[PDB]
Design a protein around this ligand. Structure first.
Ligand code: CA
Ligand code: CA
Length: 87
């Protein structure tokens, strides 16, 4: 089980899976996840994903605790850093 971030709505386009952790922008990029690119994501039930507008877990924070086929226009293409918890 893991969190999978997708480039497009409805889990379309490019996708990358990550385990729990605290990922900065440069770390996402290394994982092949570009800046301001996340549109949808699958989340293991019970897990928590805190998506941040800016790098180093700052800026606006959006939280997801389940598969989300459309993060919506407000959070769309804004992820720069993210914290994933298996709780
Ligand atoms: Ca996108
Ligand atoms: Ca951003």
């Amino acid at each position: 089980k893991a969190v999978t971030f997708y480039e497009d709505i409805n889990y379309g386009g490019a996708s990358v899976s990550l385990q729990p952790g605290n990922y900065t922008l440069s770390q996402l990029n290394t994982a092949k996840i570009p800046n301001d690119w996340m549109t949808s994501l699958k989340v293991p039930s019970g897990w928590t994903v805190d998506v941040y507008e800016n790098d180093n877990f700052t800026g606006t924070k959006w939280t997801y605790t389940s598969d989300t086929p459309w993060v919506g226009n407000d959070a769309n293409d804004k992820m720069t850093s993210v914290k994933i918890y298996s709780t």
